[PDB]
Structure prediction request, 1414 residues.
Amino acid sequence: INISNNLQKALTVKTNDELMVIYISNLVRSIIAFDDLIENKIQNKKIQEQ
Amino acid sequence: KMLMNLHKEQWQSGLKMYDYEEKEESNLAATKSMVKIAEQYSKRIEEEKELTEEELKTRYVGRQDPKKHLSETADETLENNIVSVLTAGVNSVAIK
Amino acid sequence: MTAAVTSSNIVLETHESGIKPYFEQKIQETELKIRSKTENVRRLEAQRNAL
Amino acid sequence: NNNSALSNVNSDIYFKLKKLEKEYELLTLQEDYIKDEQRHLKRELKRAQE
Amino acid sequence: MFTYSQETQHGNITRGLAVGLALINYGRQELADDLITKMLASDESLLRYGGAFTIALAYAGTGNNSAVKRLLHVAVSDSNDDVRRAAVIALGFVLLRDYTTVPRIVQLLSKSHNAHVRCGTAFALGIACAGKGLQSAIDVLD
Amino acid sequence: LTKSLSIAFENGDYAACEKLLPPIKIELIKNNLLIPDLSIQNDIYLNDLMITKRILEVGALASIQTFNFDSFENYFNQLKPYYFSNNHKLSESDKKSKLISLYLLNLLSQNNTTKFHSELQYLDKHIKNLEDDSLLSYPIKLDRWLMEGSYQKAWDLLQSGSQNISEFDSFTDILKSAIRDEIAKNTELSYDFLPLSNIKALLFFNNEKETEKFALERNWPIVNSKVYFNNQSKEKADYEDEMMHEEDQKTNIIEKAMDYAISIEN
Amino acid sequence: LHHSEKKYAEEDQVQELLKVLNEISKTTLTLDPRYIWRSLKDLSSLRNQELLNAETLCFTVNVLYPDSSSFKKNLLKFITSNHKSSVPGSAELRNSYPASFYSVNTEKKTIEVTAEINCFMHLLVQLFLWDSKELEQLVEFNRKVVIPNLLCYYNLRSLNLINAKLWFYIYLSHETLARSSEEINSDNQNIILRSTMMKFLKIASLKHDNETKAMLINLILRDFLNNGEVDSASDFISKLEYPHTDVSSSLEARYFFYLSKINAIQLDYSTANEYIIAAIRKAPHNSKSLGFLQQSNKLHCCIQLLMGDIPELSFFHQSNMQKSLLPYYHLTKAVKLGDLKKFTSTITKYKQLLLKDDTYQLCVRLRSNVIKTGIRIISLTYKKISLRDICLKLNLDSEQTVEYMVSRAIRDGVIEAKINHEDGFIETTELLNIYDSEDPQQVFDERIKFANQLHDEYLVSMRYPEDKKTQQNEK
Amino acid sequence: TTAAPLLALLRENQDSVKTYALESINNVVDQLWSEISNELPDIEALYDDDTFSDREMAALIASKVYYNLGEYESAVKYALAAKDRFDIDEKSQFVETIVSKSIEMYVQEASKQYTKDEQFYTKDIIDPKLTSIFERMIEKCLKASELKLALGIALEGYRLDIIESALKSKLDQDSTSENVKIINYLLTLAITTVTNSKFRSSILRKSFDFLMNMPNCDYLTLNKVVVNLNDAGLALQLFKKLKEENDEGLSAQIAFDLVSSASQQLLEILVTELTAQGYDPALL
Prediction:
């Protein structure tokens, strides 16, 4: 039961790291998201012109 | 049905079990190794803050994912011991 | 003319106001619920997509 | 204006959402299906590895 | 027709019988429910291949939740190739009226890399948004 | 009505008090309408409040003495809004200090420390340091001596509290009984053999026949002049198992593994 | 000049407002209006505090005022009048909008949508009173006007959540005015306050507005701790349905704090201890939270002493709070030593400092626990120990007295001993070898389930903002 | 302040202060709601007795308290217990809270008893006080004048009565287009909210009858009904109307819409019926 306890807890370590990692992925993707909005302004007008 | 049935261990495989010596070996091997995967993961995650994932994996040996490798080794023995207890106690309580 | 600071004209425009929370509670309850299910279905998709 | 003939604004939000909650039952149906898909895919991850 | 399907030894005849039962139990919804259960319960792939289509045509254009559930479960849960394919194509028939929901339901089946599944996923978008294009439908098919 | 009650207390008749109060309950309504209910307090309402307060007060002390603890609490409860508000304008009174002391003994004679400290907290904010503890000291010193666990101190305080003849003594006789009952849970854990003289000594008795009498009622089997605390424990444990709850109350070796298993595969 | 400074500030406010107003016009949302609102609230308060007084006046004049201009003006005359910035074209404008409250549209009166505007003018004024930091009449005027206005109409999901942040200021100004002075008429005004709080919660109950619901509960709890109505509050806490998944972390800390105080007074110190450590973790390390942390950490030291658990020496040193936690430190050394003589000194010396924190009510209960700890020392040091020996060390009065102290203490199982009357000693019974027994099994079972629950928190959080980013136009 | 006085008064056995106490407890009810919830079975004790005429007041405390405790269903029982004193609780700007839950409560019961038999408003399974509350809320929509809101709650609530009466009264010819508009809104919501076959056929069939009584009706409105239900009987009777008129253009128009829209099986029986009905051969 004690080995099972350490192992459940080992799996929890691994997952809290995977929790932080995807959270960094989101922090990164935020920059891209901001930049995209200013950029889409230019594209809309061109496609309507054609 | 003939094809499927390849066992007389359909009802004689859950109460049937391997000695506790062998379960002590699995427990001892499993705990001992996970330290080693855990020491590689510690060298590894001194990084994880530079440029490009693909580079980090080569240089500081992110290969095969040690994060994934520890999860697999923990999952296999974790699921196995629940069975080992689960069958153990089942026998004690039902048989006597 | 009339305001959303307070109600204006008692039991005329407060007669209209008077039949309003019966409609709005139903769907206000439905909004919060179906926003967390919508996020949840995508959560379990994400999970089976990595698998 | 905003509080005069308010019972006419009331009826169109009420109508529109009522139609969509039928269609929003088909999206929780999907949540239910993909709980099963991962269990079938976990035995097939096992079979593929096998 | 059902019983004759097991007697016949020519494969084409079973195929033809299985879907033609679907055609006869068209538009009948919940009265067709008893038949649906025998066709799915079988161990013959053709009876399942036709099984999917009986749900599709009886509950056709009404987004009945029970019908879509069977078709979903069966698609995934059978290893037999015809059986998989057929369940996917069936969805479009059911969700003909409410095609708003079709791309979000079938995103799943196109994620998976089994080919028969993927063949039927396309076809389901074909049927569902046949009437009028949906920009999303096109995007998933590219 | 009002004034007939006043002189009923002075006599030392407290049955006369109790008897005469149901009319005055009609007239307390007229009094409750006279105050606005503490929405605004003027000196008109200060005269009206005196009437109101008076009826409850003289009745409340009298309930004690006639062994009507229930009536006492009822009367006491009505005061509480008047005491809350309006401080140093007939809201903290000589009478307040006297009635709070007796209330605290009443909570204590239930042998609940839960209400007592909760009530104690309420008092910090009013009288407990304004007019000080000097009569409010009696339940607070008593509470002390049982929290540390000295029953000698409690016993002594209580013995001198029968010097205080009024209405504090109506609670003395309950509370001496309460020290015994408290001690009798303790002794199960402390001892498994006690002599007959020693059980008597410990529970503050002087009559052997009384010791053996209490034992029937407290469910102890004194057989041959030696108590068997252990018999008693057995019965007490068994009963708590006996009412259903019981598979998961116990927990099974098999059941733990089942719980853990389903969590991982969900 | 002076005008120019109010105009540059104003245009910042208008974008944030314009931005919320569109999201809520489409269909109400909770969190997305919320994120915008929280940034703006901070900035507005910093701009009003440092700069001008009539910078608030400017905005109120500029937009339609239902009564707000007159209400602002009353305030400004008392603390030094203002009549500037009343000019036209800063009052014939209704700022810039695409058409939602644009200068031509609002005059034309095809629309009039004072709703949200009403809500922002109330935030400006409510902050201004608190920035002034003056009490008296000024507090009272602030409560009167704003509360009945917000209650005549039924609020939308957006407006309701705004009004929770207004309510705070109301309680806080009123409460300090009451603690500064003793006026007999204020007690009667407190009853009116109590009534308003609970009605606000019931209105919000219907609309499922989760932040409003949580914020109100904290205030009501505070109000009980100040009035001594601990008695009522036992009732209150068993019927809460507090949100955790949709509220700010400041509320969640406050909530955890209150519980430990109320639980502790009812002589449950087990549950008290778990609740305070959670409040501390929610609450940051900054000097922005500094007075919160000081009080929370006072209560935690006292909790561990009430258990007989005792805090370590580590704690006080590694904190840099040494002077503040000095009465608790002396307490911790005192209880440990089992000195009744020291303890009498500690709570006497420090009396005032303790009572202000309202842990003094708890502290008196330790004069007893000082004794129980002390006799526990004795039974560890000496396994079998004469009744006489114990009486000698802690100045206890008879063999019979110490018998009785220990009888109470071992019902609570502190000492974990049993008295032999027939030999005359007190014998501890612990010898371990409890690994053999089923006790560790019980412990290991609990540990796993705290872990399985942590997996659940991880799963729900992780994947939910990913799902948003995909929907979003960004690739 | 505290409710502790009020408890004392019920616990007293002089009747006058108990009457009083019912009145006073309901004054401070949404402030001292937790305290008095603990000793709410007292309040109920007084309600059961038959020495009191202040039963309604006593019921009334509990309904307000029980909401705040968090059990919504229990509130509804005590409100219908009290009987009246609740038509001033729809016009409160602080309590419509009990009323809304009651409306929902009717729908749970109403679904169950529709499927069995169409009529069930002569049954005693639905409480009569509850029936009243539903009917007066709907009347309240029709007071400000909006039939869209009245139709919506009745449809959920499975009513034949309410829907029948709203369209009947909405024939009075104030604008022909306007009346026809309300009947479409009814056909649409029926398909899109309800797919339970029994109520859907019924509401739809009902609409056919009200359109045709009007001295002008759009027939696109009329045709929609026939094709969902697939009835040749509606179709036969529609034509027989135009055969009374002998009007060339109407007869050609409906027929073109029919052939496209309608299913093959329906048209095939229909032509045989018109042929023995008698028609100009042009339509055939």
